[PDB]
Structures are given as structure tokens and as C-alpha cells.
Design a protein around this ligand. Structure first.
Ligand code: YFR
Length: 182
């Protein structure tokens, strides 16, 4: 409908796949080469389904900060025959607050879904499902089961992936450029 939705659509149309694990179907953001991200609660194994194709997992790393605190981001390298468009230059370098964000989801349950969530707070610490978690972003939208892995964008920046909610607020794990240096 406007330039926020334009940037979100550009990311969804080229840089997402549908990931299926034993714990469900997730929006999965591809970042560069065969490297993608997914919430750590997806419990990625040795094999994952990518757009309903059986795919070997070459590497999976559940990220923690240097306090050894959960970040809820797993970086996955996929044995796929095709590379993602490199979007690392759209990742923030530092922790920050944002205005006017969009949460975008693409699954069998929620195809082509875009939500204007408004202001995003650098919330920091969250007890997420009983697990102490750092680098959480918060938005005041009643997000629901099925939106985990959804991409959080502003115009020109990919800032997080949706990892939970409490019925009134939604919570995303930050994406930082430093997670994807090589
Ligand atoms: C009520 C409650 C906790 O129920 C869910 O199952 C749920 C899942 C996601 Br994902 C979310 O953003 C928010 C949610 O709200």
C-alpha cells in the first residue's frame, strides 16, 4: 500500500522459503549464498523441508551472546542448488529502536501476509517460553501462532525475525550484520 510494504514485498518475493521441521512450518529468511535463519525453537535437524523439497542441513548454529544467553536465532546452511540474493547490506550494525515496521509471513496457513506493526522498541531481556533471551525487539500487535520466522523490516532495513508474543505484544530476535561476516 506504501513504501514500507514495497520494501517488505521485495524481501519476501526473493529472500524467503517455506521451512518445515518436526515442530512446524516457518517463514525462513535467506541472507546470502545458501545461508538462512529460523527461530531456534524450530529445532532444525540433519534434514529440513524447503518449499516441500527434502534438503540436507550442511551446518546449523543456535546463536548465544557472550553472556552465554539465548538469542533465539539459528543460522542454517542448506544443501540447495541455488543461492539467495545477498541482502547483508540491509542488516543493521547495532542494537536500535525503529519507527513504522512491517512483519511479513509466507506459509501454507498465511500466504502473502503483511502486518504494519508500528513502533519497534529495543526491549532487551525477555523470558521467552521460560528461556532467558537477549536482543529482543517488541511491537504492540497481537501476533498469533503461525507467524514465527516472519521478517521484520523498515524501509531499507531487515531488522529481525518474529519469535513470540503474549497476546497483546509481539517479539522479534534482532538480526545484526556481524552474525553473517565470512
Ligand atoms: C496467546 C499466544 C501466546 O498464543 C500463541 O500461541 C502465540 C504465538 C505467537 Br508466534 C505469538 O506471536 C503470540 C501468541 O499468543
Amino acid at each position: 500500500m506504501g513504501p514500507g510494504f514495497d520494501f517488505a514485498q521485495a524481501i519476501m518475493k526473493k529472500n524467503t522459503v517455506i521451512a518445515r521441521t518436526e515442530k512446524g512450518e516457518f517463514t525462513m529468511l535467506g541472507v546470502y549464498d545458501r545461508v538462512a535463519v529460523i527461530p531456534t525453537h524450530a529445532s532444525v535437524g540433519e534434514i529440513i523441508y524447503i518449499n516441500d523439497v527434502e534438503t540436507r542441513v550442511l551446518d546449523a548454529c543456535a546463536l548465544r551472546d557472550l553472556t552465554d544467553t539465548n538469542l533465539e536465532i539459528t543460522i542454517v546452511k542448506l544443501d540447495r542448488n541455488q543461492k539467495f540474493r545477498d541482502i547483508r547490506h540491509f542488516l543493521p550494525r547495532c542494537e536500535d529502536d525503529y519507527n513504522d515496521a512491517v512483519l511479513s509471513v509466507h506459509t501454507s496457513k498465511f500466504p502473502n501476509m503483511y502486518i504494519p506493526v508500528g513502533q519497534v522498541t529495543n526491549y532487551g531481556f525477555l523470558n521467552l517460553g521460560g528461556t532467558p533471551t537477549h536482543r529482543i525487539l517488541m511491537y504492540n500487535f497481537p501476533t498469533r501462532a503461525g507467524q514465527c520466522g516472519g521478517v521484520v523490516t523498515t524501509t531499507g532495513k531487515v531488522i529481525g525475525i518474529h519469535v513470540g508474543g503474549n497476546g497483546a505484544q509481539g517479539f522479534a530476535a534482532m538480526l545484526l550484520h556481524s552474525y553473517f561476516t565470512d
